[PDB]
Design an enzyme around this catalytic site. Structure first.
Site, PDB file in Angstrom:
ATOM      1  N   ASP A 186      -1.956   5.061   7.162  1.00 51.35           N
ATOM      2  CA  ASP A 186      -1.289   4.099   6.278  1.00 51.35           C
ATOM      3  C   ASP A 186       0.136   4.586   5.902  1.00 51.35           C
ATOM      4  O   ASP A 186       0.560   5.669   6.339  1.00 51.35           O
ATOM      5  CB  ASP A 186      -2.197   3.905   5.055  1.00 51.35           C
ATOM      6  N   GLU A 205       6.837  -2.026   8.616  1.00 53.42           N
ATOM      7  CA  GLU A 205       6.936  -2.879   7.439  1.00 53.42           C
ATOM      8  C   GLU A 205       8.369  -3.271   7.208  1.00 53.42           C
ATOM      9  O   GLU A 205       9.255  -2.416   7.179  1.00 53.42           O
ATOM     10  CB  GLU A 205       6.396  -2.174   6.181  1.00 53.42           C
ATOM     11  N   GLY A 226      -3.093  -3.034  -5.617  1.00 53.37           N
ATOM     12  CA  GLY A 226      -3.811  -3.018  -6.900  1.00 53.37           C
ATOM     13  C   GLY A 226      -4.598  -4.290  -7.175  1.00 53.37           C
ATOM     14  O   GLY A 226      -4.595  -5.218  -6.358  1.00 53.37           O
TER      15      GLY A 226
END
Ligand code: NA
Ligand code: NA
Ligand code: NA
Ligand code: NA
Ligand code: ZN
Ligand code: ZN
Ligand code: ZN
Ligand code: ZN
Ligand code: ZN
Ligand code: ZN
Ligand code: ZN
Ligand code: ZN
Lengths: 333, 333, 333, 333
Positions: D94, D160, D200
C-alpha cells in the site's frame, strides 16, 4: 417544597388548562430522589416522584422487603430534601394491583388519614389503584370506594382502564368511568387510559401508540356529561413514556395527558456513567495484580454523583418534552 | 429499633465491661444504610451508622449540598428502617472540625434539644467534635461546653486528641482530658485517642499502630482518678479501622476501644460487585452497535442489590472481628 | 540469526557446562514470535521459540487447521525476523504424541531432511517426541528410530519419560534411556524427565516439584556409563516452567536442566495490556450510544504493540531467572 | 494458491470486463492474513492482501521496525497459507511516498526481480507508488520508470493522482497519465484516482464522494486513445472503502473500479470480539482480589480466534458488496 394537596391540584389544573404535563419519575433510593428533584429544579419545573411496589421493596432493604416501610422511608427522606428546593414536588405510588392493596395503598392511605385527622397533610399526594387485570365493573367498584377514602385524606387517586404492555381502552370503559366516578366533583382522579403504551424501551416500529383513543374518550365523556364536543373531562396519565417519539408526546398532550411516567430512560441515564466509571477506572475499582485498588474511585460517591447528574439531565429533557419546564407554580425565574 | 439514649449507653457499657466493640459504618445513602443495618442484623449485633460531613453533603444531593439537610434526611430514613430490625442501631456524626461546628454539629444538637424538650428522644445518639487541629486547651474548652449541651439532649459526645492520618497522643493530653471532662459523671464521652491510625487502606508495613499508647492513657487516667492500675476510665474510638490486622484489633479491644470506624473496606465491598456487573453485562448497560441495551441489567436495582449484599457481608465480618456478633442487647438468638 | 545446528548444539553444551538454561517460549503468531525474539535480544540472550500442536493449528488459521502448515508458515516468518537480531534463535516443536507423529513431527522431519540433502540447514533445530503416554519400551523404540532420523537431518530430539500434569520419573526409566540412546554419541537428545511438573499457573502449595529426581537420574546414568558420581550425562528439559519458584529453578539448573518451557506466564503477559486497553478505551473500541468508535484505539496495532512489549519483558525475566541473560554466543555486549 | 502474475492479470481483466472488483484487505499479522484469506474462501472469491508501510513496520516487530523485513516475513507466511486454499490470493504493498521508495518499494522490487531472473515468480504481485504529494509531472516520471521495472518483474504498479483525505482528480491529470503510461501495453497499472475518498470511518454526510470524476476520466482517456465514448481504459482503485454506502460502491464499479481498499472496517471487526471477551471474562484475564486469573481465557488464542472469525465475516461482506463473491477463477463451486 413538597406539594400540598392544594398546590398539587392547582398543578394538575394548570397543566390541563394549558395542554402540558408533568414527568412522574420512578425512584428507588436517596440518589434517584435527589436526581429527580434536581432535574425539576434545573428545569424550573414542578414534578412528581413515584415509587413502584418493587421500588418500595428495594427501598426497604434486603433485610426487610416491605413495600410500606420502603415507601414511608423514602417519602420521609424526600420531605426533608424537597423543602430545600423552590419547586413543588408531589409524591405518588405507582401500579398497585388488587392483591397488593392491603399491603401497599390501603396502609399508606391510613397513615395519611391519621396525619390529616391531626390537622396535617398527607404523606403522599396521590396513589395508584391499578385494577386493569380485573373486570371493568369490579375495577370501578374498588375505585369508587378508594376515591372516597383518598379524597377524605386530601389525596388524588390514579386508576387504570386497559393494560400496559411490557392494549387499547374501550368506549364503554370510558362511559362507565364517568358514570361511576363523575368528573372531579367527588374527588379528583387521574385516568391511565391505555392506548398502546408499553413499559420499557424498544427500537422504533415496535410500540404502536394510538392517541386518537384518548381523543375519543374525552368526546365520549363530554357527551355523557352534556358538555361541548371539545371538553376534556379526563385528566390522563401516559404510562411507559420512555422511548416515545416527540410527535407522540405532543398529540397525547393535546388530548389531556397531564402526567407522563418515566422510568426506563432515567434508569439508563443513571447507570450509563457508572458503567463508564468502572471501565476507565478498572484498575482502581478492582484490586488487580496484587495492588490494593484506589479508594478515590471505589468510593461510591465518585460514580454515584455522576449517575445523579446524568439522571437529572434526563429529567430536564422530560420537562422540556412535556412543556412544564419554566412553569413551576412558585415562579422562581 | 433505633437505639434510645439509654440503650446506647448500655451498649457501650456492656462492650467496655466485656472488652468488645461496635462497628461504626460510614453511610451515604439509603442503600448503604440498608446494607449496614442488614449486616448488624445478620451478625445478631447492635451497631452504629455514621455520617461524615462529606457523606451528609452527598446525601443532600448536588442541588443542595447542605450537611444538616443530608444528615437529617438520612437520619429520618434510618429511623423508619431500623424500626423493622430486632437489633439496636445508633446514629452518629463523624469528624466535625471547628469551622464546621456552626453548620453541622450545633444545628443538629439544636434539633435534638427541641425533640427532648417535647419529651422525645434525640435524632442522633452521638456527635463527633474533632478538635485535633487546634491546641489541646482550646479543643477541651470547646469539648466541655459541647459535652454539657450533648448530655442535656441525651447525646454522647465523641472527641479527638491527636490527628488521624490519610500521629500519637501525648500523656499530658490524656491528663488534661480527665481533668476537663471527668470520667463520665458529667456526661458520657468517647475518646478518639490516636495511636498511629490512618484513614484508608494500604499494603502491610505502611500503617504503624501503637496500641500501648491507649494502655498508657488508661493508666494515666486511672492514676489521676485514684483508681486501681488496671482501671479503664476512657471509652476509646479506633479511627481508620479498615485494612487493620486482627492482632491489632485484639490489642486495641483489650485497652478499652468500644467503637471502631469502618469506611474504606465497606466502600470496596459495595463497589466490587457493581464493577463486576458492568463488565459481564457490558453490552446490556451500554447501547452498543445500534442496539438499545438491556433494561433488566441497567435497572439500578440489579447491581445495587448486589452492592448492598456485599457490603452487608463486610459488616458481618466487622462484627465478628470486634466480638460484638451474637451480643445484641435485644437477645434475639 | 536462526541458530544453525552447530550453534544450537554449542548453545546447549555451554548451558550444560555452566549450569544455566534457555527459555523455550511457546508462540502462536507473528506478534508472539516477535515478542519472544525481542525478549531474548533485550536480555542479550540466545533462546528457543516453540510451537505446540495446538499453536501450529492456530497459526494455520481457522480455514486450514493443519499443524504442518501452521508450523511451516510460522517457521518461515521466524527465519526472516531472526536474521535481523544479533542473538541466536532456535526453532522447536512441542509435545507430539504417538497419534500425531504422522501429521506433525514426521512430515516436518522430512521437510528438513530434503533441505539438508540439498546442502542447507533444517527448518527446525529440534522436535519433541512425547511418548510418555505409552509404555517405556515402546516410547524408547520410537525414540531410537526418530533420533537416527533427526540426527541425519541435523536436528536434536526431545523426548519425555513421565507425564506432565495439567508425575515422577522412575530409576529404571533413566537406565533404559541411556541403554537405548546412549549419551549423545548417537545424536544429541534432550530429556524431559518429569519431577512433579504441571502445565499451568496455580497458587503456591499446589505444585510439588521434586528436583532430587533429576539428581538421581544423573547418578543412575553416570553409574551406567562408568562415569564419576558428579557427571551429568542427561540434558534435561523443565516442562511447566510458569509459576515456578526461584529456588526450584535454581536446583533444577544444578542438576542439568538446559531448557525450561514457558507458556502460561507469557500468555498472561501478552493479554494483560490488551485487557487494560479495552477497559480504558471502552467507548473507542465499542460503537456506543450512536457513536462510531475511535479508529486509533480499535486499530489492532494499538493494543498488540503493548501486548508484544509486555510479553518481551516477561521473556527478559525468564532469561535472568535461567541465567542465560548476557550470555548469547554472538557476544554483542 | 498465491496468484501468479498471469492469474492476477486475468483476475483484474475479468473484474473490469464484468464490472466487479476485489477487496484489498490491509493486514498486519499472521492472524489478520488468516482472517482475510478465510474471508475470500468463504465467499468463493479471489482477493488481495496488502501491507502498508506502518503495517509492515509492525509486522517486523518492535525490535526491528523495518518495512522490508516486515513485508517479506508476512509475505513468506502468506505464501505457505495461501497454498492451502482453493482461491487466488494476490499480495500488494500500500501507499509508498517518494521518501520511502528507497526503503520499501525499490528493495522489494529488487527481491522479485532476482526471483524472476531465476525462473520464479515475484514475491508480491503489485506495488503502490503514491506520488500524490508531488507535482503530476514528477509523479508520472517516477511512475514511468517504476512501471518498466515492475513489468519486467511480472508486477503490476498502482499509482495515485489526487490525495486521499484522513480531494478530486483533474482532467489534465487523467490525460497526462495516458500520455505517459499508455493503457496497459507498456505494462499493466492500476490508477487510484481520488474522487473525495477519505481513509477512516465517519458518520454519514461527512465524506462526499463524486464518482462522476471516474466517469469523466474514462471519457477523457477514451478520447485521447481514439476509442468509443463508452470505453474504460483505466483500471481504478477505490481508496478508503470502509464506511461507504452501497449506492456509492455500485456507481464506482460501473466506472471501472477493480480494487477497493478496506482497512478501518476490518480493524473494527477484528477488535470487537476481543473487547467483548475482555469484559465478560474480566476476572479471568485479570488477576483480581488475590486470585490467579483463568488461563483458558487469557490464552491469546481464545480471543484471537474470535477476532479472526469476525474479520473473516466482514471480508465476506466486502466480496458480496463488490460482486466478486462466487467468482473465483478456480471455479470451486
Ligand atoms: Na416505554
Ligand atoms: Na485504615
Ligand atoms: Na507451570
Ligand atoms: Na473510509
Ligand atoms: Zn406504568
Ligand atoms: Zn412565572
Ligand atoms: Zn475517622
Ligand atoms: Zn443473649
Ligand atoms: Zn510441556
Ligand atoms: Zn561475551
Ligand atoms: Zn489508501
Ligand atoms: Zn464458475
Amino acid at each position: 417544597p413538597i406539594a400540598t394537596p392544594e398546590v398539587y391540584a392547582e398543578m394538575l389544573g394548570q397543566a390541563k388548562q394549558n395542554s402540558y404535563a408533568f414527568p412522574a419519575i420512578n425512584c428507588t433510593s436517596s440518589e434517584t430522589v435527589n436526581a429527580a428533584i434536581k432535574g425539576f429544579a434545573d428545569a424550573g419545573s414542578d414534578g412528581i416522584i413515584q415509587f413502584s411496589t418493587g421500588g418500595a421493596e428495594f427501598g426497604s432493604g434486603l433485610g426487610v422487603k416491605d413495600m410500606v416501610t420502603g415507601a414511608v422511608a423514602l417519602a420521609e427522606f424526600t420531605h426533608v430534601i424537597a423543602a430545600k428546593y423552590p419547586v413543588n414536588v408531589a409524591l405518588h405510588t405507582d401500579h398497585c394491583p388488587k392483591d397488593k392493596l392491603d399491603s401497599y395503598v390501603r396502609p399508606l392511605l391510613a397513615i395519611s388519614a391519621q396525619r390529616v385527622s391531626k390537622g396535617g397533610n398527607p404523606l403522599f399526594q396521590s396513589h395508584m389503584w391499578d385494577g386493569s387485570a380485573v373486570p371493568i365493573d369490579e375495577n370501578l367498584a374498588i375505585a369508587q370506594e378508594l376515591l372516597k377514602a383518598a379524597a377524605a385524606a386530601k389525596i388524588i387517586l390514579e386508576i387504570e382502564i386497559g393494560v400496559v404492555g411490557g392494549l387499547y381502552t374501550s368506549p364503554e370503559d370510558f362511559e362507565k368511568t364517568i358514570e361511576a366516578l363523575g368528573a372531579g366533583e367527588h374527588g379528583k382522579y387521574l385516568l391511565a387510559a391505555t392506548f398502546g403504551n408499553v413499559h420499557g424501551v424498544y427500537k422504533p416500529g415496535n410500540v404502536k401508540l394510538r392517541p386518537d383513543i384518548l381523543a375519543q374518550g374525552q368526546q365520549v365523556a363530554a357527551a355523557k356529561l352534556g358538555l361541548p364536543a371539545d371538553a376534556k373531562p379526563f385528566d390522563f396519565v401516559f404510562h411507559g413514556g420512555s422511548g416515545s417519539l416527540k410527535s407522540e408526546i405532543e398529540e397525547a398532550l393535546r388530548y389531556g395527558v397531564v402526567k407522563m411516567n418515566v422510568d426506563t430512560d432515567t434508569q439508563y441515564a443513571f447507570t450509563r456513567p457508572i458503567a463508564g466509571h468502572m471501565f476507565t477506572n478498572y484498575d482502581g475499582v478492582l484490586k488487580v495484580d496484587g495492588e490494593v485498588g484506589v479508594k478515590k474511585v471505589y468510593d461510591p460517591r465518585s460514580y454515584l454523583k455522576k449517575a445523579e447528574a446524568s439522571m437529572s439531565q434526563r429529567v430536564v429533557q422530560a420537562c422540556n418534552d412535556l412543556h412544564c419546564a419554566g412553569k413551576s407554580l412558585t415562579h422562581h425565574h
